[PDB]
Design a protein around this nucleic acid. Structure first.
Lengths: 437, 218, 1006, 57, 69, 65, 57
DNA sequence: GAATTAAGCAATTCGTAATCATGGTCATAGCTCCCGCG
DNA sequence: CGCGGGAGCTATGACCATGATTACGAATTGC
């Protein structure tokens, strides 16, 4: 029976498994850059490598710290002399740092979770990555619902023409200035201030990254002063159709900018207590520090909501509003003209082929969840703890089964707005009935 | 570099300092297999059985493992042919020429490459026979290849039927490549790209890629 | 022309031929050569699209191709399964041809030869000789296996030839080497075509002096100098080792039906062929039946890599590359695959197999006479013991005392043997063929003629022991049953695991049903939930426990639920409860409950909350029709076993129904296995879900069941849980029992397919009668469709340590109160092979003592806790001080493999150190005896560090040194932990375990 | 009631101290946490001696 | 309040001020010991309530500053 | 009482407790003056003046000369 | 009603201390006499500070 | 020369290794007083 | 008289040692 081998080996010498191993190598070199999906693909491919070649030099990973600091260097807060040569200056922005690696998902620094981005920004990033293969990742900044490319770190080419292409497909970019130097100019506070002024961007920048033409391992330089300013109140500001930013306010009226809700709650900002800020020339930037109080995560979220208002819930990086919710919210989430009833809505969805295709592909629960701007996992956790009475795909009656989810105030706020969610869900079930049935 | 006594016909085994922890057991096995081995006219010269023991193992990171020497005109170094009449080393030269593009070569040698130790599993074969001295070289081959796979990172095996049990023959897990034999029909050694796979698997283990163009003889 | 198929076998390269070894009625062996093709199945348009024309193409009819893809659906908008009916052709190719979009490529070419030509591999066939083309004497060529193999005559008996052998080799060290140690003895059991069972042993004359040789000739052992002088009739023949090996080569080159040797491919036949290349250079040449090709005997090492964890190499079996049609059978590999024993060497296998009860009629000072017959033991056990005792030399008495046989007399229905035994008090003892109290290295060291004849007797005992193990396990009948059932060659029956042995009857099923199952997408990985093992509600039962086991539960689950990959309409999943309720309502409307069954399973993904699989029961699938065929054929062969009178036909039909039982149990496991041809994650997970639901249903009706006034009242409503059923749902059920019975039933435990019901009664025959009433009432009213339970046993004094670990006495349905209790132990330390025999014996005696306190009456557990702790303390200190118990009673075992996540595991390193230091090579899958050894100079140790570094593998050559000792403390730790887990109060047990070993004992929580 | 108003303004001044350390205690460093935990444990040792001296007499 | 370029001077202020109130409370400790040694009859239930309130206040102060990591 | 070492040790260790207690009296008087409650210190002034007279007499009588 | 009896007990303890120093003071010897004199300078400094606190109003 | 198979999970026990509760010890800041030198 | 050097008490966080907890893997049985 040696027409069947003694212990049969696969076609692991073939060129297809060679390309699979090269994909494993390229994904291992960008293991910290990639999302959770490419990490799971890497783990499955390492399992394949152990199954075939009996030992692989790399190993399966469970948690990966998402850090692009290997392509960066330690930041300095002292004035320093710079070398002569060509230099490209790119501002580093205040908001949450995100990267778009070759896994075609939007990777978040510090947690590695894949963030949900709009379709036009996704298409522009895909066209940027398909135009130029040599880009390792696309560093982005999320603040005030604006996806802006802070930097485009690549090995071979400069980021200047990459930023020009990003301007071509519609990605928002900072102003690039190629300013050369002759002598060893001391990079002091005045030259940094006039450089930030010459950037001429109204968006909040925290530091400035200078780019060498032919040298990698790029450096960020930050000038700031640690300050401790007393706090009057925490006020919310409108940055979108339904969502809000936290903005913490001192006694004098200086607006200390907060990166996101997670930045506000990991530093444990309390009313009438001191906070750690990075003092700048114009803006005030809160430090990325951890609070030292004994108050837990749910209780600090609860007291932040109680100070802001009980009609607010945490939606990822931004707070959000609840209230009356009819056809206009579904209209603005369908990016079409205003509606008074179901019939005009379904007729103009029949007019709009792309909108009809998006209705067909997306489920009714996902559509109605995105209509009211709910978080994904938090709303799944809320629905998974309660029962429903359903007739003809419509929630005619709902009652809550587990009270233990209501200690989280975001879950309680979505449970308060669940009547409007039920109304909008009945509307979208009616729409899906009058289109595809 | 180091030498131990042998009661039988080679009478001397020259080995490197990193080949030391297997030598007492290799002499123990050879002193019981050689009295029956040396009756047959071996394809390598019996003084050339252990040339590959004169090679260090720390600098080697990949091992090209054949099952036996060539049945005629055995040099004693695996896949070494100054005459270059052997078909197997001709297919190795063809595959490395497909890797590099270097088509103007007189011969090929896997011994001269940095990081490559060419290996015969069974260290000798009878003239005109394949796997003839397998029963003599079985435990010796298990011991010596276990030492190599403890030292090197990637194991490359030039036989599908011959090296099908290579995970049983080695006690420690190693990166093993059970590739097709160069003399195999249906052009399966022409089809596969195992040396590229060797290079990729070595960069997965943070090792230096093999300059395969070093093995060409001009 | 009437033949019966012996073996099927393929040509070794060059032209690829398939041969059939067959036997006529007169005993003449008939070989039929077939052209073996690479069979391929394509559609009509692919068949005409082939640029090279096929060698052969037979019209296979309109066969449906179904895409079996488990695609989850988050709504009920599920597309229909891709069924494409097309004309299909069997592309028979002499060379391997890569055909794009060729379906049914998973099956073997030998199975495609079998099903398409209508040939059963275990079948008797009248051959049309016009299709047979004669090649040479005894070999034919059949180019048309359709019309030639068309007449299936019934089964006729055949004179099968056999060569059971075993060899002995000289050794001064622990294990022989081939190159420096000669062969001393080669014994054979030459059963030829005439049935003349010849038991002859070859003596090596080079290990004897010349005066010793002529003394052996004068003692009756003839001496030969060549092959032509050799006579197989004389039992003891002296020769040189070259003549001995040429006799071995001549015997192995003979075309036997079965050459069977225990550990022979690994050791005996390999040593024979290697020493044959050594001394004379000859080779055991296996020639083809048409004599075109001739191959030499080369033992190829076949390793079975595991499929769990790191997918390391798990088992290693050694085989012979013969092409003459002989099924070279290694019994060591077969009993390694089948039986669960501590060591698989021949002594322990013969001890477990040939065990008999022997009463004592005559007692002596040193000669103790044992008589065994049908009164002492079961029917046929004493006859088997006499059959082994015909060539046997040593009998082990009461598992401890090994006795040499002085004189042996074979009775008509039993045996009569005197034994070298001390005088013993009891009358009935267990007689078995265990170890052999000789030291074979020293016995070879002082080698003289009496030693040579004694180990010739031991060698012929081992060679005939291969025959007695062959007939004990029914390996010829199991081989024929596996050939007919799995539709494999007779050589290929045991050498393949579940997937290849299901690919035959699945090929049969797919060609009757005109179905093709294809998997276009890749197969991804999910864990799921198996059967529901209930928590035992009481740790002890003084009452009887009724055992209601489902008759092949998961086959009935698949047949009932139509749980096949192609009958899966879709998998409905929900990430939220609202979509779950919408999908529940739309599943109630869209798929009606009689035609479709909705199986509420666990989620395959962590974000999902529900996963419902829908199965169409309008037509039955591959899994239900395959399992219905398996269960119907098992019932049919069991029925013919009931209407059989001869022991041979009874053995054939018993092996037939056993093989159908094994393959029907295997269909479950191949659905969950990812790489199988039966793979369906939805159908396997639905099988476990529906089986769990039936377990909950049968437990819930039997929880609190009250049989009052001759009427059975079930506590819960008798509803079919999957759908509304037409049958009656009234829980109060009339019985056929007397009115005075007022008994309460409590379902205390539940297995994967068994539900344990505790009746409050303690009378045995009453419990058996009431439980038979419960079984028939459940099968008539509680259960439904194909679901039937079989009452297995009444468990008297059932002692459950934990889940899946219990010890009890068997009172089966056929048994009664007057019958002797039979000890069923399941999952506890007596079945455990990582538990020493000392631990097993003491847990048996102390559990019997606690069973005795439960049988005497209600008395407090504090005092009994105290006295068991005192008796245990006395016995463990006496064992630690005296060390009177031998090395064998303190000896654990382990299976060796390479399925290890960590490369530096001390088990793998320990077996590596054994194979590197000691000449015995432990293979993968080998079971090795190990013990815990520390130097004797150390004192009694409370705390434990590096226990696994104290492991040392013990073989037959190992002797305990004076400076070394057994580490008894971990044995006492494990044993004391098992005592205190059975005990009630924790407080005294923790104090005892801290005063004896200084640790906190782990306690099971119910 | 001199000790009453004495304990009253110790309560008032200590509550002012608790409010200002509550204002600054979100952002305290490690060696600060060490030193002020030392200083607070010295003060609670002082009030433990107070409790023992006013309970026993 | 307002802006602090370095917190650490205010930390020196709270350390010295809390040292001052420890000197006050040790002073009232060793003068309450003096009036207990004087032998005058007193009722210190209100002192027990006051030190209970003081203990609650200092445990509130210690509950969120003592433990790191 | 020989060598007067124990008496000197006693009159060193007691006066440290005495200065601790009179600093405690001054500290608690500063505390109750910082309370804001109106108080009168006539008899306290009389006691302070007579203990000042006694401690000046003790200082005049404790001189080594 | 408590500080006056506290300083009365202080005056009584100082009376006992002054009488025992007057008893032992037939011989004092210079180094411990100078130490007690510097302790009396600390005494009159504390008395001067408390007299300032009672005369400041 | 090559040629593929390979049953599922539940559940328990024993040993090993990472992690943490508890406790001992050691620097270490506070911190408080004794002595002293101008 | 006033502040520095020094010496000794005194808790107190950081760190190390010991032992109990728990995940983690192998062995094994069961069904």
């Amino acid at each position: 029976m040696h027409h069947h081998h003694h212990h049969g080996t696969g076609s692991m010498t073939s060129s297809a498994d060679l390309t699979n191993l090269k994909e494993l190598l390229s994904l291992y070199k960008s293991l910290r850059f990639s999302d959770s999906v490419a990490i799971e693909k890497y783990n499955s491919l390492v399992e394949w490598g152990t199954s075939t070649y009996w030992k692989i030099g790399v190993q399966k990973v469970t948690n990966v710290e998402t850090s692009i600091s290997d392509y960066y260097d330690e930041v300095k807060n002292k004035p320093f002399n710079i070398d002569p040569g060509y230099y490209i200056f790119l501002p580093v922005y205040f908001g949450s740092v995100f990267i778009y690696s070759k896994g075609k998902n939007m990777v978040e620094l510090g947690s590695g979770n894949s963030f949900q981005i709009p379709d036009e920004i996704r298409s522009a990033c895909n066209k940027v990555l398909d135009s130029d293969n040599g880009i390792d990742f696309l560093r982005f900044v999320l603040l005030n619902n604006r996806w802006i490319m802070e930097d485009a770190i690549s090995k071979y080419q400069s980021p200047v023409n990459i930023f020009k292409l990003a301007s071509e497909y519609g990605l928002n970019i900072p102003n690039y200035l190629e300013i050369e130097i002759e002598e060893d100019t001391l990079f002091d506070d005045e030259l940094y201030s006039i450089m930030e002024r010459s950037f001429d961007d109204t968006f909040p920048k925290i530091s400035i990254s200078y780019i060498k033409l032919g040298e990698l391992k790029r450096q960020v330089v930050d000038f700031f002063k640690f300050s401790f300013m007393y706090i009057e109140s925490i006020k919310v500001d409108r940055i979108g159709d339904n969502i809000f930013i936290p903005s913490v306010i001192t006694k004098s009226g200086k607006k200390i900018l907060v990166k996101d809700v997670d930045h506000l709650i990991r530093s444990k900002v309390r009313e009438h207590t001191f906070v750690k800020v990075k003092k700048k020339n114009t803006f005030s930037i809160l430090y990325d520090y951890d609070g030292n109080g004994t108050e837990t995560r749910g209780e600090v979220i609860k007291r932040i909501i109680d100070t802001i208002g009980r009609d607010y819930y945490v939606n990822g990086k931004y707070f959000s509003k609840v209230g009356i919710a009819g056809l206009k919210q579904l209209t603005n989430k369908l990016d079409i003209n205003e509606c008074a009833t179901v019939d005009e809505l379904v007729d103009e969805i029949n007019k709009s082929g792309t909108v009809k295709r998006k209705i067909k592909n997306q489920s009714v629960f996902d559509l109605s969840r995105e209509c009211l701007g709910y978080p994904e996992a938090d709303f799944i956790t809320l629905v998974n703890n309660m029962r429903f009475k359903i007739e003809n795909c419509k929630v005619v009656n709902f009652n809550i089964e587990n009270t233990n989810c209501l200690n989280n105030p975001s879950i309680e706020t979505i449970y308060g707005n669940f009547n409007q969610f039920v109304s909008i869900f009945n509307t979208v079930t009616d729409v899906k009935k009058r289109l595809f049935e | 570099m180091n030498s131990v006594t042998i009661s039988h016909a080679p009478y001397t085994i020259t080995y490197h300092d990193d080949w030391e922890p297997v030598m007492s057991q290799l002499v123990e096995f050879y002193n019981e297999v050689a009295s029956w081995l040396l009756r047959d006219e071996t394809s390598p010269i019996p003084d050339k059985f252990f040339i590959q023991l004169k090679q260090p193992l720390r600098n080697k990171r990949v091992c090209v493992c054949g099952i036996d020497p060539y049945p005629k005109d055995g040099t004693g170094v695996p896949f070494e042919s100054p005459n270059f009449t052997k078909k197997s080393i001709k297919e190795i030269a063809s595959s490395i020429s497909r890797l590099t593009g270097v088509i103007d070569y007189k011969g090929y040698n896997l011994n001269i490459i940095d990081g490559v130790i060419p290996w015969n599993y069974y260290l000798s074969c009878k003239l005109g026979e394949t796997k003839s001295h397998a029963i003599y070289w079985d435990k010796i081959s298990k011991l010596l290849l276990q030492h190599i796979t403890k030292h090197v990172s990637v194991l490359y095996c030039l036989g599908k039927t011959d090296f099908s049990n290579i995970r049983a023959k080695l006690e420690s897990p190693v990166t093993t490549i059970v590739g097709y034999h160069p003399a195999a029909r249906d052009h399966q050694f022409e089809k596969d790209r195992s040396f590229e796979i060797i290079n990729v698997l070595l960069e997965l283990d943070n090792k230096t890629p093999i300059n395969w163009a070093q093995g060409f003889i001009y | 022309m009437d033949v019966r198929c012996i073996n099927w076998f393929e040509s070794h390269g060059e032209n690829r031929f398939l041969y059939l070894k067959s036997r006529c009625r007169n005993g003449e062996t008939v070989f039929i050569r077939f052209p073996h093709y690479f069979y391929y199945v394509v559609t009509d348009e692919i068949y005409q699209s082939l640029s090279p024309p096929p060698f052969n193409a037979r019209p296979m009819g309109k066969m449906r191709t179904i895409d079996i893809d488990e695609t989850i659906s988050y709504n009920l908008d599920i597309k229909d399964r891709k069924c494409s009916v097309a004309d299909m052709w069997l592309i028979e190719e002499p060379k391997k041809r890569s055909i794009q979009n060729a379906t049914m490529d998973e099956f073997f070419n030998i199975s495609w030869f079998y099903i398409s030509n209508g040939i059963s591999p275990d079948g008797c066939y009248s051959l049309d000789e016009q299709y047979l083309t004669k090649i040479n004497n005894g070999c034919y060529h059949c180019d048309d296996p359709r019309n030639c193999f068309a007449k299936e005559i019934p089964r006729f008996d055949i004179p099968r030839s056999y060569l059971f052998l075993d060899i002995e080799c000289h050794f001064d060290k622990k294990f022989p080497s081939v190159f420096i140690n000669p062969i001393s003895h080669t014994s054979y059991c030459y059963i030829d075509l005439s049935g003349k069972r010849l038991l002859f042993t070859l003596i090596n004359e080079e290990m004897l002096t010349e005066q010793e040789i002529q003394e052996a000739v004068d003692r009756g052992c003839l001496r030969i100098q060549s092959l032509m002088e050799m006579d197989y009739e004389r039992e003891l023949v002296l020769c040189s080792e070259i003549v001995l090996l040429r006799i071995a080569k001549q015997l192995l080159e003979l075309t036997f039906d079965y050459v069977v040797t225990f550990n022979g491919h690994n050791f005996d036949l390999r040593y024979i062929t290697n020493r044959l290349e050594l001394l004379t250079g000859e080779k055991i040449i296996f020639r083809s039946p048409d004599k075109k090709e001739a191959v030499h005997l080369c033992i190829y090492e076949r390793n079975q890599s595991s499929h769990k964890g790191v997918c390391g190499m798990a088992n290693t079996t050694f085989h012979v590359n013969n092409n003459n049609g002989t099924i070279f059978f290694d019994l060591y590999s077969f009993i390694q695959k089948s039986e669960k024993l501590d060591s698989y060497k021949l002594d322990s296998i013969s001890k477990n197999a040939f065990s008999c009860m022997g009463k004592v009629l005559n007692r002596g000072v040193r000669e103790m006479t044992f008589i065994g017959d049908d009164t002492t033991d079961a029917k046929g056990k004493a006859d088997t013991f006499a059959k082994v005792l015909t060539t046997g030399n040593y009998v082990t008495v009461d598992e401890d005392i090994i006795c040499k046989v002085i004189r042996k007399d074979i009775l008509e229905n039993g045996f009569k043997v005197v034994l070298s035994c001390p005088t013993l008090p009891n009358d009935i003892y267990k007689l078995s063929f265990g170890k052999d109290d000789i030291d074979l290295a020293q016995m070879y060291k002082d080698y003289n003629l009496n030693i040579a004849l004694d180990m010739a007797r031991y060698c012929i005992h081992d060679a005939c022991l291969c025959q007695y193990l062959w007939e004990y396990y029914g390996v010829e009948t199991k081989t024929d049953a596996g050939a007919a059932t799995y539709v494999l060659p007779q050589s290929m029956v045991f050498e393949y695991r579940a997937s290849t042995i299901i690919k035959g009857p699945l090929l049969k099923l797919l060609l009757e049903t005109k179905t093709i199952l294809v998997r276009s997408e890749t197969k991804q990985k999910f864990p799921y939930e198996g059967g529901k093992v209930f928590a035992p509600k009481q740790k002890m039962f003084s009452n009887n426990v009724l055992i209601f086991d489902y008759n092949s539960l998961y086959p009935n689950v698949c047949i009932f639920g139509n749980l096949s990959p192609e009958t899966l309409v879709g998998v409905v999943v929900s990430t939220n409860r609202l979509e779950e309720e919408i999908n529940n309502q739309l599943l109630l409307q869209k798929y009606p409950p009689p035609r479709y069954i909705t199986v509420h399973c666990e989620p395959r993904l962590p974000n999902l909350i529900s996963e419902i699989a829908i199965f169409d029961r309008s037509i039955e699938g591959t899994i239900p029709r395959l399992l219905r065929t398996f269960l119907a054929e098992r019932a049919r062969y069991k029925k013919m076993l009931k209407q059989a009178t001869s022991s041979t036909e009874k053995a054939i039909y018993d092996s037939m129904q056993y093989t159908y039982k094994i393959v029907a149990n295997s269909v479950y496991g191949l659905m969950g296995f990812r790489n199988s041809a039966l793979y369906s994650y939805a159908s396997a997970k639905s099988c476990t879900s529906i089986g769990r639901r039936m377990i909950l249903y049968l437990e819930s009706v039997l929880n609190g069941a009250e049989l009052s006034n001759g009427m059975l009242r079930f506590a819960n409503t008798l509803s079919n849980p999957f759908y509304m059923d037409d049958r009656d749902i009234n829980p109060i059920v009339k019985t056929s029992l007397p009115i005075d019975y007022r008994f309460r039933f409590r379902s205390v435990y539940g297995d994967t397919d068994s539900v344990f019901t505790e009746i409050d009664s303690q009378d045995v025959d009453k419990s058996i009668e009431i439980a038979k009433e419960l079984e028939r009432l459940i099968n008539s009213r509680v259960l439904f469709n194909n679901f039937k339970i079989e009452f297995e046993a009444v468990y008297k004094n059932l002692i459950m340590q934990s889940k899946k670990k219990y010890t009890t006495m068997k009172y089966s349905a056929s048994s009664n109160s007057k019958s002797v209790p039979e000890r069923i132990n399941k999952g506890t330390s007596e079945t455990r092979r990582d538990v020493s025999k000392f631990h097993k014996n003491m847990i048996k005696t102390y559990k019997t003592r606690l069973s005795e306190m439960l049988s005497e009456g209600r008395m407090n557990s504090n005092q009994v806790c105290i006295d068991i702790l005192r008796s245990l303390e006395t016995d463990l200190r006496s064992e630690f001080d005296s060390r009177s118990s031998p090395l064998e009673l303190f000896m654990l075992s382990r299976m060796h493999h390479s399925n290890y996540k960590s490369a530096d595991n001390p088990n793998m390193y320990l077996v590596t150190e054994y194979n590197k230091n000691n000449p015995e090579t432990i293979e993968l899958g080998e079971r090795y005896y190990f013990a815990y050894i520390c130097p004797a100079n150390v004192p009694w140790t409370k705390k434990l560090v590096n226990i696994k570094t104290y492991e040392t593998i013990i073989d037959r050559s190992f002797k305990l040194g004076s400076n070394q000792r057994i580490f008894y403390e971990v044995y006492f730790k494990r044993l004391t932990s098992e005592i205190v887990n059975l005990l009630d109060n924790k407080v005294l047990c923790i104090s005892f375990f801290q005063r004896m070993f200084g640790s906190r004992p782990t306690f099971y929580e119910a | 009631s001199d000790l009453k108003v004495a304990t009253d303004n110790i309560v008032k001044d200590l509550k002012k101290i608790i409010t200002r350390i509550s204002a600054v205690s979100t952002v305290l460093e490690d060696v600060q946490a060490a030193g002020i935990s030392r200083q607070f444990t010295s003060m609670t040792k002082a009030i433990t001696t107070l409790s023992d001296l006013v309970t026993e007499g």
